Amino acid sequence: ALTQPPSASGSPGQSVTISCTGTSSDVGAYNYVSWYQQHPGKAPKLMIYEVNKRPSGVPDRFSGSKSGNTASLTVSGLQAEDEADYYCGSFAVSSVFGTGTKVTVLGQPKANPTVTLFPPSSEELQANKATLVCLISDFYPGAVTVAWKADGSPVKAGVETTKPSKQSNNKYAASSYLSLTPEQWKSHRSYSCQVTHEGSTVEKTVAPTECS
């Protein structure tokens, strides 16, 4: 319900603003918007409450504001440790927390993803299962969105996607799976794995009748 951009970035010392969009009943009706920072493997920490207040020991380079149905978190003078997931949160939003934004503090050149899409193997089909495996590699910043299509229509059931994590060459990789029955697999002309990275999309397609 509270919508955030999936990612945002800046180089050390630059500013970045991330937005949190709700409705007139929550962000527009109340000044009780919060911002939480979460580093990998750690609990969230409150960075901003009541739209613009900072807990003690949150650096003043974090500031919060609200206009309309949108709250915004601004980091003025990013430091590398600010790289984290940021969630907004609001009173009167049913699950409270926004969809979250990975803020990257840029430390290497932008790298576009390679997408590798494997159809179900003959062996897995013979075991009565059908997994499409979409491997996404060599991207940076480490934030992607993955969407699946069957015959051009969006497919949400049966998808599991892993959070990007570092490769040993320090670019990122992520994986996504579309788990189908063999009957489902054969009942469509094509399937696609569509990766959105930094506002642009790369899509790979396979077909049950096509030797990928």
Partner 1 sequence: EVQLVESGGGLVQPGGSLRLSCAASGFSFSSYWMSWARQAPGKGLEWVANIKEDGSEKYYVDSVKGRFTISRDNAWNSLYLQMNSLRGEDTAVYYCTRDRGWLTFDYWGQGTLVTVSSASTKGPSVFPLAPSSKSTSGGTAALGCLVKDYFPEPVTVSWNSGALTSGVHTFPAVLQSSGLYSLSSVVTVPSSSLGTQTYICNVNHKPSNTKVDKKVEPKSC
Rounded CA-CA distance 113/140 in Å is 8
Q: In whole angstroms, how close is the CB of 1 to partner 1 at the nearest point?
A: 11
Task: Give the Cα-Cα-Cα angle 5, 90, 73 (nearest 5 degrees).
Answer: 45
> Taking CB under 8 A as the rule, does residue 62 contact partner 1?
no
- Toward Mg ion, which CB reaches closer, 105 or 206? 105
By CB under 5 A, the residues from 137 to 196 that bind Cl ion are 167-169
168, with CB counted inside 10 A (0-12, 13-18, 19+), is exposed
Of the candidate residues 61, 118, 196, 207, the single one contacting partner 1 (CB under 8 A): 118
Spatial distance between the Cα atoms of 180 and 186, rounded to a whole number of angstroms: 10
Residue placing its CB nearer to partner 1 in the complex, 56 or 200: 56
In this chain, which of 12, 13, 68, 107 binds Cl ion, going by CB under 5 A? 107
From residue 149, alpha-carbon distances to 76, 80, 197 in Å are 39, 36, 17
Q: CB count, 10 Å around CB of 93?
A: 21
| Chain contacts with partner 1 (rule: CB under 8 A) | 30, 32, 34, 36, 38, 42-46, 49-50, 55, 87, 89-91, 94-100, 116, 118, 121-124, 127, 129, 131, 133, 135, 137, 160-163, 165, 167-168, 173-175, 177, 179, 211-212
